[PDB]
Design an enzyme around this catalytic site. Structure first.
Site, PDB file in Angstrom:
ATOM      1  N   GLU A  11       0.908  -1.321   0.026  1.00  0.00           N
ATOM      2  CA  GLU A  11      -0.206  -0.096   0.141  1.00  0.00           C
ATOM      3  C   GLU A  11       0.929   1.251  -0.111  1.00  0.00           C
ATOM      4  O   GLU A  11       0.482   2.574  -0.341  1.00  0.00           O
ATOM      5  CB  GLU A  11      -0.908  -0.008   0.998  1.00  0.00           C
ATOM      6  CG  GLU A  11      -1.947  -1.270   0.975  1.00  0.00           C
ATOM      7  CD  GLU A  11      -3.058  -0.978  -0.189  1.00  0.00           C
ATOM      8  OE1 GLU A  11      -2.815   0.041  -0.959  1.00  0.00           O
ATOM      9  OE2 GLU A  11      -3.798  -2.101  -0.178  1.00  0.00           O
ATOM     10  N   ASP A  20      -5.863   6.433  -5.033  1.00  0.00           N
ATOM     11  CA  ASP A  20      -5.614   5.104  -5.139  1.00  0.00           C
ATOM     12  C   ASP A  20      -5.742   4.557  -6.642  1.00  0.00           C
ATOM     13  O   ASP A  20      -5.933   5.244  -7.629  1.00  0.00           O
ATOM     14  CB  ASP A  20      -6.186   4.035  -4.042  1.00  0.00           C
ATOM     15  CG  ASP A  20      -7.448   3.893  -4.541  1.00  0.00           C
ATOM     16  OD1 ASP A  20      -8.092   4.073  -5.758  1.00  0.00           O
ATOM     17  OD2 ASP A  20      -8.272   3.069  -3.849  1.00  0.00           O
TER      18      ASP A  20
END
Ligand SMILES: [Cl-]
Ligand SMILES: [Cl-]
Ligand SMILES: [K+]
EC number: 3.2.1.17
Length: 164
Positions: A11, A20
């Site tokens: 991440e 994202d």
């Protein structure tokens, strides 16, 4: 290696609001803020999550705090899901981490629906499961990450996260 280190690698760590891979506002260590295309909405979620008026920037400590909550919440969801619980319980710790990883990224609902993959996993048919898992939007959209997770399920080792 452990689920935190693993997801930390998958991440990244960003202290300001960013989009994202799906184009959704996120912050920290993959902390999904909202699916709303509104930055303001995202800021509102951030402030609520953090407990202060941030203006879209957080500290490392704050990033870590959300992350820990997120990891725990994913696990907790798994344990509360009728479809995932049995699978999750049948796995060794390494593989459990792979599962938590998937839920964290894809969302509990999505994962719980992979009926066939889930069955192969529970049956301990590693190679088969691995092949099955790749037949997904998940793999197609984030193949490098997917491959790491998949190798983890296939092997039961952290080799995919080896030189990371
Ligand atoms: Cl939250
Ligand atoms: Cl990827
Ligand atoms: K990310």
């Amino acid at each position: 290696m452990n689920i935190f280190e693993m997801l930390r690698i998958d991440e990244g760590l960003r202290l300001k609001i960013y989009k994202d891979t799906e184009g959704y506002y996120t912050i920290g260590i993959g902390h999904l803020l909202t699916k709303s295309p509104s930055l303001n909405a995202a800021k509102s979620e951030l402030d609520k999550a953090i407990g202060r008026n941030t203006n879209g920037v957080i500290t490392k400590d704050e990033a870590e705090k959300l992350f820990n909550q997120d990891v725990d919440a994913a696990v907790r969801g798994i344990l509360r899901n009728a479809k995932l619980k049995p699978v999750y319980d049948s796995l060794d710790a390494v593989r459990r981490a792979a599962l938590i990883n998937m839920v964290f990224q894809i969302g509990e609902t999505g994962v719980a629906g992979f009926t066939n993959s889930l069955r192969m996993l529970q049956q301990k048919r590693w190679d088969e499961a691995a092949v099955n898992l790749a037949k997904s939007r998940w793999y197609n959209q984030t193949p490098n990450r997917a491959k790491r997770v998949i190798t983890t399920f296939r092997t039961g080792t952290w080799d995919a996260y080896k030189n990371l």
